[PDB]
Write a protein that binds this ligand. Structure first.
Ligand code: NA
Lengths: 139, 16, 139
C-alpha cells in the first residue's frame, strides 16, 4: 500500500473527493493520489508555486493544480504551528467549485479536495492534522 | 502474487 | 499492492473509468483494480474465457467481466506483436456502452475501460503498451 494508505486515511470520512501526498524536496512530484483526479496531475512547477518564496502573487494571479485554475483563499504554509493553505477551484460558468487544503510537513505536502458543499475549515483541519502527524514522524 | 517491476521514500508507520 | 500503481498509471490520463491488472496463469485472479468497478469482480472462469483455447465461442455467446455482459469486438490476444483484445459492454437498456481493451503479457492481463464516449483505439494503444512493458520486464 505504501503512501496509498495515507490517501485512504484522508478519504475515509467521506468529505473529500480526492487526496494526495506530494513531495517537495528530493522527490518533488506526486507520491500517491486518488486515481484519475486533478491532484494526480500536479506538476513540479505547480509544486514550486505552492512552496515558493513568493507568497503574494498567487492571491492576485491564482495558481493551477493539475492545470486546473484555482484561487488562494489563505496562506499559512510557512506560519510555524500551522503550515497550511486554503485554496478553491475557480468556476468557469457557475458549475460548483471545490475547496482544497494543503498541509506542509518537512518533506511532503498533504492535499485534500472537498466534495461539493464541503467547507474549507474541516479540510484545513484534516490537512493540518496529517501534516502534523507526518512532521512528528520525521516526514 | 509477485512484486511488480518499477514503473519515493518508505512512509512512516500509521497508528495501531 | 504495488500493482495499484499500475492502475494509477492507466487511469492518469482521465480517459478511463476503471483499470485492472489480472493474473491469468497460477495466480488467476484480480491483482489490482479500480474500486467499485466491474473489473474488481472479474472471476477465474471469466479469465479462462478471455485467455482460453477457444477463440470462437465468445463471438457467439459473448462474455462477462465482473458478471457484466459484454461483446468481443476484435480478438488479437494470441497475435504476435499485438496481444490485445477489444471488448464492449452491452447496454442492459438503457445505459451507455463502454469500450474495454485487454493486453496480454506473460503472466498478467491489463484491462482498461473508457469513460462514456471514449473510443476503443486509444484504449487499445494503452493496453498494448502496458502489456508490452510488462512482458519485457518478465511479467
Ligand atoms: Na478478431
Amino acid at each position: 500500500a505504501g503512501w496509498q494508505s495515507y490517501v485512504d486515511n484522508l478519504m475515509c470520512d467521506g468529505c473529500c473527493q480526492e487526496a494526495a501526498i506530494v513531495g517537495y524536496c528530493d522527490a518533488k512530484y506526486v507520491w500517491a493520489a486518488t486515481a484519475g483526479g486533478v491532484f494526480q496531475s500536479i506538476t513540479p512547477v505547480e509544486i514550486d508555486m505552492i512552496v515558493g518564496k513568493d507568497r503574494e502573487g498567487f492571491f492576485t494571479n491564482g495558481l493551477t493544480l493539475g492545470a486546473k485554475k484555482c484561487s488562494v483563499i489563505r496562506d499559512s504554509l510557512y506560519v510555524d504551528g500551522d503550515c497550511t493553505m486554503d485554496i478553491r477551484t475557480k468556476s468557469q460558468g457557475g458549475e460548483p467549485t471545490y475547496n482544497v487544503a494543503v498541509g506542509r510537513a518537512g518533506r511532503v505536502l498533504v492535499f485534500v479536495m472537498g466534495k461539493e458543499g464541503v467547507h474549507g475549515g474541516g479540510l484545513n483541519k484534516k490537512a493540518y492534522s496529517m501534516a502534523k502527524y507526518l512532521r512528528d514522524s520525521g516526514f | 502474487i509477485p512484486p511488480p517491476p518499477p514503473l519515493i521514500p518508505p512512509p512512516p508507520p500509521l497508528p495501531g
